[PDB]
Amino acid sequence: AMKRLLVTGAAGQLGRVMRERLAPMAEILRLADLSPLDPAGPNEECVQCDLADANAVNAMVAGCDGIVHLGGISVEKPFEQILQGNIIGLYNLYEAARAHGQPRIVFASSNHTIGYYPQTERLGPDVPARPDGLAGVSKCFGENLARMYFDKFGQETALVRIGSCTPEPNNYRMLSTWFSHDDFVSLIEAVFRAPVLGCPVVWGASANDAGWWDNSHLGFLGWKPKDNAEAFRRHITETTPPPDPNDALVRFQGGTFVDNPIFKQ
Amino acid sequence: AMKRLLVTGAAGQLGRVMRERLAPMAEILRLADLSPLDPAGPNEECVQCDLADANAVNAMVAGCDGIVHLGGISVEKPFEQILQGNIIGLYNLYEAARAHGQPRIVFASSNHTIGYYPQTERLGPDVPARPDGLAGVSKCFGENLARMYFDKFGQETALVRIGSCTPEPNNYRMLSTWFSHDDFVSLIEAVFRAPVLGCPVVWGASANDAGWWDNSHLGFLGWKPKDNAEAFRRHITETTPPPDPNDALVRFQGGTFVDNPIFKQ
Amino acid sequence: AMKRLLVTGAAGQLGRVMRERLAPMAEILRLADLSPLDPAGPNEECVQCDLADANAVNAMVAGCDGIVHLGGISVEKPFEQILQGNIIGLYNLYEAARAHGQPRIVFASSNHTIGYYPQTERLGPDVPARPDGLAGVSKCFGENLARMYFDKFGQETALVRIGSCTPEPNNYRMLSTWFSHDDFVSLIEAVFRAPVLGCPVVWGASANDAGWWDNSHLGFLGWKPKDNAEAFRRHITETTPPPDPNDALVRFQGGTFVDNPIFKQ
Amino acid sequence: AMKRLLVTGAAGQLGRVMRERLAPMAEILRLADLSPLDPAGPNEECVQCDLADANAVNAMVAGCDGIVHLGGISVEKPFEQILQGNIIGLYNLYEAARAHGQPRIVFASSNHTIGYYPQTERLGPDVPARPDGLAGVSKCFGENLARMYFDKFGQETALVRIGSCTPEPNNYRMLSTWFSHDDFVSLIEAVFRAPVLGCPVVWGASANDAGWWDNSHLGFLGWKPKDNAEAFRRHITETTPPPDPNDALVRFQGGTFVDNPIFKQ
Amino acid sequence: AMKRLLVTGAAGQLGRVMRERLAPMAEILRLADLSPLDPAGPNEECVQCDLADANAVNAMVAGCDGIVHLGGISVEKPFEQILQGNIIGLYNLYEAARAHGQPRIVFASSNHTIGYYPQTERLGPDVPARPDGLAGVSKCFGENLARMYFDKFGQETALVRIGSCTPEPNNYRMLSTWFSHDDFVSLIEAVFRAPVLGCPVVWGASANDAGWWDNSHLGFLGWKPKDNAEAFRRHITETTPPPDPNDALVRFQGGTFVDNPIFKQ
Amino acid sequence: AMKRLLVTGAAGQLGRVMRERLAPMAEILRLADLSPLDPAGPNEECVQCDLADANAVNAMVAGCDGIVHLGGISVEKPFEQILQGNIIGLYNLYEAARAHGQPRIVFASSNHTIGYYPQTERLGPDVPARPDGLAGVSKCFGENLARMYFDKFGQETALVRIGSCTPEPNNYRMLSTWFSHDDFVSLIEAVFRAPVLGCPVVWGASANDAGWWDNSHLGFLGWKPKDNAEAFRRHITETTPPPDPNDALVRFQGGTFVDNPIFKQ
């Protein structure tokens, strides 16, 4: 599919998965993270750098034909860390791409951009943001920045609002939010194969009977997820306590993130 | 279903398909075209006439219980040819129907009525027209005329905006626009069986993963296409050159029609 | 699912089905009706009373963890009868629930709340009511009352606008309105399992190709009907007279109810 | 305008206003109420009857060319009183109208049909009901019944959702809900003069800067209210205590009605 | 505003008004009509020709900086006449403009493009067409053709759906459809002054209290009509017969045009 | 209206205006800026601090009952400066407010959050952001952060998307975007007087005939701007060159900001 694909956040949980699963997409896979990476094998390059370091990010991106941007802060943390990984880091990534041929980007956004919506409300891609903490706010920043680079320079980005990308659903909320490895992989393949992408919002979930999100406007991309969290409903009842109706886990799309305070260093 | 079914445009590529496939729908199939028709076999009648000749169209329609109107200009041509076949011709068809019991009509409209929309935009049946040439404008004329006859006289018409009704998808655009022979035939069967039809806009496409159009409002008809162009994606990448992202073929719903000039005779 | 489930209208056509099919949902099924009930078997309790009598309704509800409310008038009748079963009866039911722990309610509303809409119009859950008679108006009363108790007290109710819940479709309208026993049972299961329900409008139909109604906004519940009336189209055409296009049966969503007069005592 | 106009609820605060202001609209004004009416002057008839008494309502309506229906319960009361005045009473009114030439009806509905909406939400005429008590639910009943008589028999009704029809705004909520006497009178004049009315929902409010409701779809009637509660804002801050932000008065469109319990006799 | 402005249909009722009122907009006014024109005065040119004749239309347009296109058939007539003036004539006009610098066009479309909508329905600019006869269908053709030339060549046109442009309202329908001379003149001024126009639908009515149409989306143009037909209501009631509620005049937006047959030569 | 009102950015152009105009709103006006301020007069406190300095911001906010936040970067600048004033600065302001009683905030957002929309498109408050540079993106950050603090802590903020707040309109774009001093002052008064505000988007423009923005959903606030840029149209024609139709000034809502590159330090 391409000569060189960059995967950032490659030492993280999703990154380790994609390091294996996206190998067939490119002759060379370049893996990057702030954290130490397992050594490069055949057809791999490994890079260590902070997203907040502009010169390092420039070098990280140079020579890459595509980027799967998983690197950054995924859970609620103090502002200082979010600022570095998700705000400054995003600016540096977009500037680096702009300097090196505008390789297409798959951005790991988050359901936390809309975490304060009730689970009873079905959402299209144009709904106003309701971020459930600083992490969500920073993912909104990434989306707004990507949109600006698209309108201004034509840089294309898939804004993937990831639900819960896990080996299997493991609580009641994931019956709605589960995004299987297979379905995220197929989405990434669909994003890179498209002649024209634009800067679309993509709801990152499998084809769950209990899904909250409407991807119908993305029809042009031809991506239909195949897995379905509903198959795990009994598994969940037989492995977890029944949710309290007052629990954020079943009240808000962001789940317990709404209960987070502003964390401090 | 009925004693006699009229198929216009019967010499054309699509009409030749329907001459074969719609036979079971009527005791007699009347085939008509401006061009020479293969001679009538059993249970057939053949009539060669110009849609622009009112007296001929009156006789063509007389004694028919339904009409599949494929006849006319469906590619970009100079104004005079389109005026005769698609504007004068449509007036003549509707007047003929009005004089002979208002047989129900399946009208071959076209995606070219909306050809200037970007391929990234999903369309419902009520979107404003954006025709991509004179052919598209003339198909809009047919839709507007049909609506008027419906409101004024009760004449019922299915306004079928045909995508690409071909044996198989064979380019990137057809992954979205493909309308299988089987699915068009089943649509026609559903149109004629309905006790009440009205004058609905119908998107002429199969159940393609990459489809751009929303047929949900047509639910009352009970027609669900079964074919899916997505099955051909791999085959298409294996047997055709990758599209240029700048090509109208992958930018506009009307494809290369947007690039057509106004043709002169 | 629960210790004790109440099924009202248990002597009726649908009640007799649910008395059998809902047994696995609770340790004890309590059946109630105005009319005589077949004697209680193991795991059953049976009570005979009028919904219009508050003391009786209090006793009927006391000790129940959930209610499937089928009891009442579902065909057009004189106002006097409707007032007792569907208006006074509903007030009594909601007051009894409020006094006894607010057991979740599945309310048998009706398509007759929207019976005057044309069959050609697809409806979402928020459409304004267009009741086709006093029965329809009275089911609207139930919906409005339920919504008030939800907003004021937190009482949760599924407002199920039942189409045609029969063993099989047997006329043209039922190709659209059929609601299979299996699909109603699975809906009831999905309603009671949900940690959070609210007070949603639910369109009571199976997954019919010719369905008129949009349940997409109920996605959070994870209920997907599995039956399809379309399978019966051939049989219906074979075994029944073609509808006249002027017949209410094929013109209004409420079918022949629009033709009902106001019946008098 | 007409020979005889019926005004029900004529003993009430609003009815007393209309007894005076609507006199010019008819040769004879018939006033009716359950409560004692000031004796009839010239060009008046007075009738004292209960809306729940069908025979009385028949005689009340007989010989009338139009009806302004103000009679009934418009504050929260126990169920039985509301049942008699607003449910049985509405049935009786519509049946009486049906038996006597279908005189056009102005129905006093209420903002309480939508009382649970937040004051920050702007509402169009098609929003789903959110009644704030039994009074609101019963006013919804009137709206649903009127719609049914319209669709079934052609009876025309203006469904006027009255905000606060008082001499002057005197609290923060009335800056939004105020409906001047002048503007209600002009609305009634516009309703009766219209060749074609239908069964429209009308928001009963003056042209208030802080209004919550959108009457644009009623444009065809040519009624434009002229009064504006905003003129009273300064006066209100000068003569009343500032509202507590936690008070229902400034949180819900139904104001303090949301705080009402279910009243018992 | 410009050196030379063309006004077609200049011999007609509206043309004679604009010949006078638009004189200040250009150094030279060129007046054109099929029929004889009063002789050119200072600052005028007059040309007599049929829009169906391409050579003549080329000469008519050459050297003009803008066009107010009033010429054509605006009442119901046989298809032959409409074809010449409104279909062939429109094609000729757009081709002439394309060959001569694409002077901006104000097109006299018509309310008859939407004549079958009920008067009770408020319309925005995107509603599907519901033409009330061949004249209406032909004005739709003009709109669709204009839109194609805009998308394909950048030709800008204001599609003005004229209501009733008369010296004063003189029947009930005109209380809604009246478009004063002053307000049409100011619209034309706003159209020509705009740096960017596009191809907008414009509802051609004054600021009537009983208006049916929504021009809010045209806000960017900065045009606000100032006249109001409501001022004439009393006069109209005094001096004309009350409409029968069954009259097309008070039921359909196109008024009596819905009652027109298809006229024959 | 309050004991102490904070105005940030008080040395800037809008700040100097508000220092005078908002004086009557509070017993004490506290003015702050990174830049030196003219010395405090009677009833004034003057503070010098960087918004990026958390401790200083805490002290700035402490003791204030309301905040008009004008401080920050208003034009396109390099990322480093934007990061400090609009990103870090916003976090510090919200944290400081949260620590000191959550004084209500008027936030100076910007039209640049939606700068890439065409001027021909009318925008409601819920449209997706289309920021026209880093400044717009950073104003989006402020909006998203404010929304999160509202949902999480109940902090109330008016998100005022300022158009062009100048003494008078001085170019063609300002005929649409002008926000008079008087109208901004009255908006601020309305925001502080409201019992309940929430976190609404407010379009910051006067009542311009050529306005692009719809504030109708803010109706509850009772704020209606009184000035109208249209009065200056002739003034603009007689003081500036006519805009080129290709100029960003008349093509994009953000005007020439779309033409800005990413500026560097």
Mutate to test the interface with A, among B173, B209, B236 (most CBs of A within 10 A): B209
Identity of the residue in A131, A147, A148 whose CB atom sits nearest the CB atom of F144: A131
Closest CA to E117 of E127, E130, E128, E126: E130
Contact A79 F91 (CB under 8 A): yes
Cβ atoms of C242 and B195 closer than 8 Å: yes
> What chains are in contact with A, requiring at least 3 Cβ pairs below 8 Å?
B, C, F
Q: Is E115 helix (H, G, I), strand (E, B) or coil?
A: coil
E185 to chain B, closest Cα gap in Å: 27
Residue that has been written with the tokens 């005049």 in this structure: E249
Closest CA to B217 of C257, C117, C200: C117
Cβ atoms of C9 and C49 closer than 8 Å: no
F243 to chain E, closest Cα gap in Å: 7
Calpha distance D121→C261 (Å, rounded): 40
Write the DSSP string, C198-233.
-S-EEEE----TT--B--GGGGGG-------GGGGH
Q: What is the phi/psi pair of residue F223, to 5°? A: -100, 120
Taking the CA atoms of C20, C25, C28 and C33 in sequence, report the sign of the dihedral they define.
Answer: negative
Cβ atoms of A179 and A164 closer than 8 Å: yes
Rounded to the nearest 10°, the torsion over CA F55, F59, F65, F67 is: -60
Contact A119 C196 (CB under 8 A): yes
Contact F129 A136 (CB under 8 A): no
Contact C230 B220 (CB under 8 A): no
D70 in contact with E, Cβ within 8 Å: no
Alpha helix locations (H) across chain E?
13-21, 54-61, 79-82, 89-99, 134-153, 174-177, 181-193, 233-239
Rounded to the nearest 10°, the torsion over CA D219, D223, D228, D229 is: -90
C120 in contact with A, Cβ within 8 Å: no
Calpha distance E258→E249 (Å, rounded): 9
Calpha distance B206→A110 (Å, rounded): 33
Q: Which residues of C touch A205 (CB under 8 A)?
A: none
Q: What is the phi/psi pair of residue F22, to 5°? A: -95, 0
Identity of the residue in E119, E210, E230 whose CB atom sits nearest the CB atom of D196: E119
Rounded to the nearest 10°, the torsion over CA D127, D131, D136, D142 is: 40
Domain boundaries, chain A: 1-227
Identity of the residue in B211, B245, B250 whose CB atom sits nearest the CB atom of A219: B211
Task: Give the chain F residue whose CA is nearest to the CA of E196.
Answer: F245
A128 to chain B, closest Cα gap in Å: 20
Contact E210 D219 (CB under 8 A): yes
Chain D neighbours among F 87-106 (CB < 8 Å)? Answer: none
F137 to chain A, closest Cα gap in Å: 6
Q: Which amino acid is at F251?
A: R
And the tokens for E20?
């006078």
Three-class SS of chain D: CEEEEEEECCCCHHHHHHHHHCHHHEEEEEEEECCCCCCCCCCEEEEECCCCCHHHHHHHHCCCCEEEECCCCCCCCCHHHHHHHHHHHHHHHHHHHHHCCCCEEEEEEEHHHHCCCECCCCECCCCCCCCCCHHHHHHHHHHHHHHHHHHHHCCCEEEEEECECCCCCCCCCHHHHECCHHHHHHHHHHHHHCCCCCCCEEEECCCCCCCCECCHHHHHHCCCCCCCHHHHHHHHHHHCCCCCCCCHHHCECCHHHHHCCCCCC
Contacts with F76 (C-beta within 8 Å, 6 or more apart), sequence order: F133, F134, F135, F257, F260, F263
CATH topology for the C1-227 domain:
Rossmann fold (3.40.50)
Calpha distance C23→A223 (Å, rounded): 42
Q: Which residues of F touch A140 (CB under 8 A)?
A: 140-141, 144
Contact E148 B136 (CB under 8 A): yes
And the tokens for B156?
């019922």
Contact F119 E224 (CB under 8 A): no
F166 by Cβ neighbours in 10 Å (0-12 / 13-18 / 19+) ranks as middle
Identity of the residue in E88, E141, E152 whose CB atom sits nearest the CB atom of B141: E141
Touching chains A and B? (3+ Cβ pairs < 8 A)? yes
Cβ atoms of D65 and D5 closer than 8 Å: yes
Chain E neighbours among D 154-173 (CB < 8 Å)? Answer: none
Contact D196 E230 (CB under 8 A): no
And the tokens for D219?
């444009």
B255 to chain A, closest Cα gap in Å: 13
- The number of C-beta contacts closer than 8 angstroms across D and F is 42
Resolution (A): 1.9
Mutate to test the interface with B, among C117, C119, C120, C122 (most CBs of B within 10 A): C120
Q: Which amino acid is at A45?
A: E
Beta strands D104-110 and D157-162: pairing type? parallel
Identity of the residue in D195, D216, D222 whose CB atom sits nearest the CB atom of E250: D195
Calpha distance E216→E232 (Å, rounded): 25
Rg from Cα positions in chain A: 18
Residue B108 β-bridge partners: B160
Residue that has been written with the tokens 């706003």 in this structure: E190
Q: Which residues of D touch F200 (CB under 8 A)?
A: 120
Angle at Cα C29 formed by Cα C26 and Cα C34, nearest 5°? 150
Calpha distance C53→C32 (Å, rounded): 13
Cβ atoms of C204 and C165 closer than 8 Å: yes
Rounded to 10 deg, the angle between the F181-193 and F13-21 helix axes is 60
Chain D neighbours among F 177-216 (CB < 8 Å)? Answer: 193, 195-196, 198, 200, 216
Cβ atoms of F65 and F3 closer than 8 Å: yes
E194 by Cβ neighbours in 10 Å (0-12 / 13-18 / 19+) ranks as buried
Task: Give the chain E residue whose CA is nearest to the CA of F121.
Answer: E217
Q: What is the phi/psi pair of residue C148, to 5°? A: -60, -45
And the tokens for C98?
């409020």
Calpha distance C137→B66 (Å, rounded): 41
Identity of the residue in A195, A200, A216 whose CB atom sits nearest the CB atom of B245: A195
Q: Which amino acid is at E133?
A: G
Q: Is A145 helix (H, G, I), strand (E, B) or coil?
A: helix
